[PDB]
Amino acid sequence: SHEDPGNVSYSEIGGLSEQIRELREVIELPLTNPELFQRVGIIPPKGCLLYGP
Amino acid sequence: GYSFSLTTFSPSGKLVQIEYALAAVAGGAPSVGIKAANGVVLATEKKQKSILYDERSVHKVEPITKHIGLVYSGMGPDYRVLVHRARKLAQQYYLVYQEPIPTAQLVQRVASVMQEYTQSGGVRPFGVSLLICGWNEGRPYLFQSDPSGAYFAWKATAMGKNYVNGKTFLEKRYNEDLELEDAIHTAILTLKESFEGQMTEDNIEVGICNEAGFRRLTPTEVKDYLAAIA
Amino acid sequence: TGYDLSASTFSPDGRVFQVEYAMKAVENSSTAIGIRCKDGVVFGVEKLVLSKLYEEGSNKRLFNVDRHVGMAVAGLLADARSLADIAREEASNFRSNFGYNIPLKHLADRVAMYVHAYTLYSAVRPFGCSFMLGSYSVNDGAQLYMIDPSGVSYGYWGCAIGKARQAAKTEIEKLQMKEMTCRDIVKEVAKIIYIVHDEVKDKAFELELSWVGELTNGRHEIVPKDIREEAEKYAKESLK
Amino acid sequence: TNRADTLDPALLRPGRLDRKIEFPLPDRRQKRLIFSTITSKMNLSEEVDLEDYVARPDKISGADINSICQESGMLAVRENRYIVLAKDFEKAYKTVIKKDEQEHEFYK
Amino acid sequence: LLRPGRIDRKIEFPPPNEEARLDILKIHSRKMNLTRGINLRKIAELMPGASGAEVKGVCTEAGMYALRERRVHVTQEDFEMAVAKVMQKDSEKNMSIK
Amino acid sequence: DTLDPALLRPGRLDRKIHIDLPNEQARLDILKIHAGPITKHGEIDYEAIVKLSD
Amino acid sequence: DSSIMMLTSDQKPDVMYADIGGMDIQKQEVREAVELPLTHFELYKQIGIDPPRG
Amino acid sequence: VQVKEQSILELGSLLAKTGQAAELGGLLKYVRPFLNSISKAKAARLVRSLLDLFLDMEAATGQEVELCLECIEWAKSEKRTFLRQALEARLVSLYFDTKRYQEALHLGSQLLRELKKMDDKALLVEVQLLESKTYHALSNLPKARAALTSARTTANAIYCPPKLQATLDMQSGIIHAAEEKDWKTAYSYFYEAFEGYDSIDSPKAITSLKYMLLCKIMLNTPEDVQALVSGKLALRYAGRQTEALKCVAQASKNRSLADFEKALTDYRAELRDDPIISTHLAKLYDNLLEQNLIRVIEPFSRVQIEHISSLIKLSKADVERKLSQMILDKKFHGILDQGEGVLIIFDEPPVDKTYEAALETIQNMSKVVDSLYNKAKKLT
Amino acid sequence: SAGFDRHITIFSPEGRLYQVEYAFKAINQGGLTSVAVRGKDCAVIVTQKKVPDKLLDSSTVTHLFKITENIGCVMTGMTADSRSQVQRARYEAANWKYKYGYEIPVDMLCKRIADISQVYTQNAEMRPLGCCMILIGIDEEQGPQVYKCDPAGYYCGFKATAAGVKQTESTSFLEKKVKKKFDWTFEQTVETAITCLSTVLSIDFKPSEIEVGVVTVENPKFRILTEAEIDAHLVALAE
């Protein structure tokens, strides 16, 4: 918990701008503004799986 | 991992690469055929996958001669090969005897062809079961064959999905003595029993066999008849 | 993988590993390039002496199939010799049955079908070769073709077959190919072969240059490379 | 459980557990009924048919429907509209199906 | 293992025949709550040969067929449905061959 | 590929999010991100390096 | 404790009975298994059915 | 022959549009050798086209069941199975058309003899759903539940070749409405029925609005009742029953019970089509409970003259025999005092101290009696 | 399932065989998109190219293959199977012209190609030609035709037609598009083909990438379009 060190934000990574935006849309928005996901009336997604080479 | 392939028997049972071919036949499209007193009626169940497909291109009910109808329940590309074989063979009979070939003789020779293909061991057998019928010498006939090379003779039978349910209905509803039209009615009934409900002039395709000869009916008379036939 | 044995079976993702393994077999073979000009086609092969046991003029990968058509093979050598014989046989049949020179597209299609038929069946392997086809005609101009181990045969302006397949066409495409005659393209191919792999992994190489076009009046032959000696007096100036 | 392999036959006995009940995969009409149930909560632009995706076999599990609906709904959240079009289901089919598919119409 | 000085009496096990299926039916059905008025030999001739514990399932699910119609008495039509319930063991022809 | 289908279903893990290898513009982007604080001169054909990058 | 004990109040998953879409076999079968011995166990006992323990 | 097959339909259509009862009935009795002549396949079409479109002309009770009896006579004369079952279904529908007490069920006991053995599973519920109607008509609630469950386990084998899903959904709403427990799902069933009632079923969509908006008033959201009579397709399918829905919707929107009574009795002939008027008098009632609660607390603020029967609204010549009826019949410990004001409700429920001891003494006297045997026996 | 490791062409349990339905994505190793359109007395093919190279030519890359003077076709999948199937179709059309005295109808050729693929499928020990062929043609008394040939040997033929990699989406768009009963006055057809590929791919690109194959009942000769008229149609649909 405490042992997160410092880092540079998501401008440091790149070339994979689909997943960046998509993870933001699936995580940050149903925790900052849940009413966008309640006005529709659809349960937010819970778990996200990153995979690849 | 055995049988594998076509050259050996099982330790006790039967031929697995015939049983699986029958399984693929039973996983085929539904169809029904009824032998009446005066004619024999064949009918199929032909749903296009999309609304793009055309219904004047591929034809399930297929004549072999001017008095012999023949349908299947299985795989079309093999169906065409064995039909073309039956065409050429019936023409060879008409070369030799100058007389239209009887349906029992067709079943003999087509069954010999299919049994030759089940002979060991390099090709697979057909995924095709047939329904052969015709009005030869007054009495009409109805002959169902199978990929194993055998054959039968039915009063009424079915092949495809839920053929057991169609067979229980044909056991229940059908009987010995009907007309051509009544056979058409109960054939469309047993086809609509197991098909999807959206059934038009195009989803079915019906050929009959009068004593006047084979007849492959049109969507005009189909929609004349099947427009809420019961 | 596994699933890689026979050439008739497919994979659970749908490709043939025998074709792929036959493709990357030619990757280990020597570098062979080709490029045409506005009135001719030039071949050039980086060829290597083993250590001291060769003779400089043996087993030349620059074949010559027809009067105006010859190969610039790379890969397994004897398989290339056999395929060259099939090409000679086909050109002979066309000359016999039609009375004039074979057009290069038709020849390439027949050879591509031969390659493809040797990819089809299971008793034989796919070929381990990749080669060039150049030609010239006064009514057709210059045509330069290219045949993979699978049988996909189509045309280029320039090519490379060998290790430095990418690393040659990196700078082949900065050549102003249309406005130049092939006599300039001779020392062009010389500098292209000479830049890649001077001394790095191996010890010594040797240059051959095949040559067809308008200057030879439809003939296809090796240059008199010793005449005008285009490589080394430019190679010693291409190291800086 | 899900796995009926790592169970002692001394457990599946008369008196202990008499019935053997599975939950098999649905078929074409059960998926239509499941769609009719689940899609009643979203706002559903009513000239978008979903039966034409039940025409795509087979191989839908029951847990996948609501995740497809979530993909469609959160894509409509990205659309900033409460309205469920067909392209939402296009992206949902293309995302939550999840190899394989072509499908078929050969040999029936 | 089947050396004759090691194993002596290899005793076959038959499939239950018509009267044998009848007796199996009478045992596995005698202790239930039947309808006043019943036949058993018809049911015994419905089966072309079951196992031992299939007839028990026939009887108990015929009792289930009685209770789904809110009854405790078991008519013949409960058996007419239970025979068809167990019938899904074997069906499936266009397999005569043999 | 070696996960349990007990874990592979949605509900627990809703959307499979796949990352793959960079394309040409993507290789350009990562290369110029790393090539920022590196002491060099104005000579760098990034297209050459990304071209040999495969 | 039964780990709290029996959930005691209102910690249901809060799922309606018609919310399960199109399961005649499953809902009817398990209804016979569990939900019918909740009520008609005194119809079970007089026949001699022995409805299952689990 | 076949040219006369369409001519039977032509002249029978004339007899149904402009012709009269005995003429088309004579035509049904006239074409009886004609069916013997023509091919028996389209015979069922002829039977349907004459019988159904004659019984859907006019209520003439000397001919409906009489021609049904004629169909029984000929169906048991020629003796075919596939044709007589439609006659069976039409006859039990005609028996339901006067809500017949037993003979409809006696006919359904013959319908169960035929259909459950055969294959046509939709033709089963084609009368079983009618039995689910008639067990509401006699209010046999669990057997109608069983019939609906049979319909639900029936209809998952059949695609939709007639319209049958919407009728099932509507009467599913009926059985969910006899419960009076769940209303939102029942409203969903009526709405799905209504989706199946678009422009092809007007005699059912004329009361589908009635059922769904009676349910939404039963759901007690008159805002959405107003917004859905403001719905576009309800305005497509409007009439006078929508005036009933709007007036009772406003009456429950503002709880003016006089508005409720007045607008309710204005449309009594259309109020008959909801035999659940217990909903209406229970909105009256289940509002009047808290009305008497807010008019039972003001009794200690300033009560007026006749503390028991002049406090309420007092509408239209003694609005009581309801309040006093709910002290008589029902209770809230609301004992009457004509001279207090508050009509005092006070009580002491826990007095179990004497209760459980009395229950002990009841059994202790029995234990003394059962010891008296030992007592009188061990001496002599 | 498998289980049997599906090596040769045999029947697997329940009930299928896996070689041909692995060959169904041998088309999908092509990386290409093909669209056929039949609305009225013309018929339109469109298919892109994938040319990254400046050293590679442009004329020899065409997958529109003229079979006969009144029959053209287009290919996807791997190129060698495609070209072999094309030479077989050419040879058998020539055999028809030799034997029967007249120009072959487009259907019979599809039947013969399907029979060849079935014979390569029926007997084992030969790789079963993983390429899909789409045909077009004009027939007298029938107007235009479009047919599709499988590697599976299942020929079929119909109005709006597409095969390749991305054609579940293309068939979805043509289900949503050929449902309205509009006429198809040949620029309607060009516009629908270009825009349906331009919605599947969503690139909206130069006239140098797609090849357009057309045949029309005013000149039954098969015809390949030129860069200028492709640009003319492209800016004509540009609104």
From Swiss-Prot, chain A:
<comment type="similarity">
    <text>Belongs to the AAA ATPase family.</text>
</comment>
<comment type="subunit">
    <text>Component of the 19S proteasome regulatory particle complex. The 26S proteasome consists of a 20S core particle (CP) and two 19S regulatory subunits (RP). The regulatory particle is made of a lid composed of 9 subunits, a base containing 6 ATPases including PSMC6 and few additional components. Interacts with PAAF1.</text>
</comment>
<comment type="function">
    <text>Component of the 26S proteasome, a multiprotein complex involved in the ATP-dependent degradation of ubiquitinated proteins. This complex plays a key role in the maintenance of protein homeostasis by removing misfolded or damaged proteins, which could impair cellular functions, and by removing proteins whose functions are no longer required. Therefore, the proteasome participates in numerous cellular processes, including cell cycle progression, apoptosis, or DNA damage repair.</text>
</comment>
<protein>
    <recommendedName>
        <fullName>26S proteasome regulatory subunit 10B</fullName>
    </recommendedName>
</protein>
UniProtKB/Swiss-Prot annotation, chain E:
<comment type="similarity">
    <text>Belongs to the AAA ATPase family.</text>
</comment>
<comment type="function">
    <text>Component of the 26S proteasome, a multiprotein complex involved in the ATP-dependent degradation of ubiquitinated proteins. This complex plays a key role in the maintenance of protein homeostasis by removing misfolded or damaged proteins, which could impair cellular functions, and by removing proteins whose functions are no longer required. Therefore, the proteasome participates in numerous cellular processes, including cell cycle progression, apoptosis, or DNA damage repair.</text>
</comment>
<protein>
    <recommendedName>
        <fullName>26S proteasome regulatory subunit 8</fullName>
    </recommendedName>
</protein>
<comment type="subunit">
    <text>Component of the 19S proteasome regulatory particle complex. The 26S proteasome consists of a 20S core particle (CP) and two 19S regulatory subunits (RP). The regulatory particle is made of a lid composed of 9 subunits, a base containing 6 ATPases including PSMC5 and few additional components. Component of a complex with USP49 and RUVBL1. Interacts with PRPF19. Interacts with TRIM5. Interacts with NDC80. Interacts with PAAF1. Interacts, in vitro, with the thyroid hormone receptor (in a thyroid hormone T3-dependent manner) and with retinoid X receptor (RXR). Interacts with ERCC6.</text>
</comment>
UniProtKB/Swiss-Prot annotation, chain G:
<comment type="similarity">
    <text>Belongs to the AAA ATPase family.</text>
</comment>
<comment type="function">
    <text>Component of the 26S proteasome, a multiprotein complex involved in the ATP-dependent degradation of ubiquitinated proteins. This complex plays a key role in the maintenance of protein homeostasis by removing misfolded or damaged proteins, which could impair cellular functions, and by removing proteins whose functions are no longer required. Therefore, the proteasome participates in numerous cellular processes, including cell cycle progression, apoptosis, or DNA damage repair.</text>
</comment>
<protein>
    <recommendedName>
        <fullName>26S proteasome regulatory subunit 6B</fullName>
    </recommendedName>
</protein>
<comment type="subunit">
    <text>Component of the 19S proteasome regulatory particle complex. The 26S proteasome consists of a 20S core particle (CP) and two 19S regulatory subunits (RP). The regulatory particle is made of a lid composed of 9 subunits, a base containing 6 ATPases including PSMC4 and few additional components. Interacts with NR1I3. Interacts with PAAF1. Interacts with TRIM5. Interacts with ZFAND1.</text>
</comment>
Swiss-Prot record, chain H:
<protein>
    <recommendedName>
        <fullName>26S proteasome non-ATPase regulatory subunit 11</fullName>
    </recommendedName>
</protein>
<keyword id="KW-0963">Cytoplasm</keyword>
<comment type="subunit">
    <text>Component of the 19S proteasome regulatory particle complex. The 26S proteasome consists of a 20S core particle (CP) and two 19S regulatory subunits (RP). The regulatory particle is made of a lid composed of 9 subunits including PSMD11, a base containing 6 ATPases and few additional components.</text>
</comment>
<keyword id="KW-0597">Phosphoprotein</keyword>
<dbReference type="InterPro" id="IPR050871">
    <property type="entry name" value="26S_Proteasome/COP9_Components"/>
</dbReference>
<dbReference type="InterPro" id="IPR036390">
    <property type="entry name" value="WH_DNA-bd_sf"/>
</dbReference>
<dbReference type="GO" id="GO:0008541">
    <property type="term" value="C:proteasome regulatory particle, lid subcomplex"/>
</dbReference>
<dbReference type="GO" id="GO:1904813">
    <property type="term" value="C:ficolin-1-rich granule lumen"/>
</dbReference>
<dbReference type="GO" id="GO:0043248">
    <property type="term" value="P:proteasome assembly"/>
</dbReference>
<keyword id="KW-0832">Ubl conjugation</keyword>
<dbReference type="GO" id="GO:0034774">
    <property type="term" value="C:secretory granule lumen"/>
</dbReference>
<comment type="similarity">
    <text>Belongs to the proteasome subunit S9 family.</text>
</comment>
